Design a protein around this ligand. Sequence first.
Ligand SMILES: OCC1=N[C@H]2[C@@H](O1)O[C@H](CO)[C@@H](O)[C@@H]2O
Ligand SMILES: [Ca+2]
Length: 576
Amino acid sequence: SLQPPPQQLIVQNKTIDLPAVYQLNGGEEANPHAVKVLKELLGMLISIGEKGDKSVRKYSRQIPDHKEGYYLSVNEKEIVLAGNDERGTYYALQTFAQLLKDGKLPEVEIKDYPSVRYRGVVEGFYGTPWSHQARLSQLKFYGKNKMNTYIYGPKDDPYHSAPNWRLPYPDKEAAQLQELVAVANENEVDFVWAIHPGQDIKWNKEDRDLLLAKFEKMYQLGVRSFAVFFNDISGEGTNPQKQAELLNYIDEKFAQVKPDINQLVMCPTEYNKSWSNPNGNYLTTLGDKLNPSIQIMWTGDRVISDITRDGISWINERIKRPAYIWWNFPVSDYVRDHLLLGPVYGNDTTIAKEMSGFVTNPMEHAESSKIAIYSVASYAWNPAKYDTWQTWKDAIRTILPSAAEELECFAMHNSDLGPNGHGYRREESMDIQPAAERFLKAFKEGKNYDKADFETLQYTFERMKESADILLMNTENKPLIVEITPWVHQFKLTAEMGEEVLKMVERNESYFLRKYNHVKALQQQMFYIDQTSNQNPYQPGVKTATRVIKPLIDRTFATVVKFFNQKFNAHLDATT
Ligand SMILES: OCC1=N[C@H]2[C@@H](O1)O[C@H](CO)[C@@H](O)[C@@H]2O
Ligand SMILES: [Ca+2]
């Protein structure tokens, strides 16, 4: 397994030992970040360098002629790690480290390069911005998965948005950003610093200059990429004319004036089809005026949506360039009581040429976003070979090797968003879903329930329980466990409720009553967790397994308690 999977892979069913004694060619001339990892990883010749370096002159025709491309070869006599550019050589070694198993390598040859030019994460949700340590750890992660873009733009950071966008960061925050930029460079990620001025911007030279001086200050901290965000604002800052003016002005007097500026990106006010006016001008203006080199961000047909051929041809035609995709998943800032831990899917795998970048807007839970981010990295680099389910499992196993089955069990039933203002849904729990649909069917009309379905429901509950208890105590990735703990509790309780509801479906009158009282106590523990964990202004609480598992239990409870209330004439409460 290689994530992301290379564009070209030939494997000989032979395997070389990692060389006990070796000879290093090119250590002094190849990318120092690439060379560090290699030296870290460990007579026989190993050749490392970029195209044009002496060490790799012999393989110069093997090396793909693509930005970030590389050639990698292992066989008995030599090893080659040769990039088309420095980032390519870094990537060559990210692939290398995934092959080295027990101090052994397969004999292979790889020609590799990304299908989409910019691949990464936009930290652009509403809510508590990632902590400093969460960001350090993200950046190492992006580098390993060949993500090359990090767009820093937290809605709730006041030096990024209204009104302190005009002020230089204070010293503590500045020294921190400076460290983020450095770690980004070492992992070969563009740190793109976004600014969001449009809520209170005045279209005068005074504000235009304070913006420039803001950028200038960021440049002094080490930033080499920039963005200007116009999303979700009202007022005079929505003027398309003024926006493109301001972006071209920044282009002409800043990006074009400094030696080493990489990405310059804007995010439009109308940023999805659904919100663009058919007869108004917003998007054709932008397409016509913005200097060709300036990227434009786009979320798809709606604020939350998957990217299709129709969707992206539609946008590319109006902005006269290929859209830079802002994909709003696994972001959950509008369903803050759900975790979105399922697979990444729904995005057309044939349209690499029609996009200039693909970024994911993640959750406010940094570590839990790693499942989707790994997947988005695998997709943006090699969409043609994009495998939904296998990537999801690879992610989990990379993120928590010591309890990967347990993490899969939990994430499998934490995928859906539940009903929401954007109408966007994910599958969840399809494994146990057929058995649940049947078993329920049987009851609400009257016929028998199948013993196989029943045993499976009971096997599910039992596995949910082991997984919850194993995850709570896992110390391999504590930060992930802190994020998900409230949901782990809810999940354990849901499964205990399900085991008790099934026992009601199998006996004698006072057993049924004990179970019924146990269930009511379990309901209340859930209400408790729901009222006191994750109490945020917007969707307070903790919901879990809500697509199939919860409604299954709530209904098998109402029904067995209905049967009872008439076969014994009692008045038991049946709500949930
Ligand atoms: O620019 C794209 C965009 N801006 C908003 C919008 O999409 O919805 C996201 C999810 O609610 C939110 O996190 C983001 O800040
Ligand atoms: Ca070089």
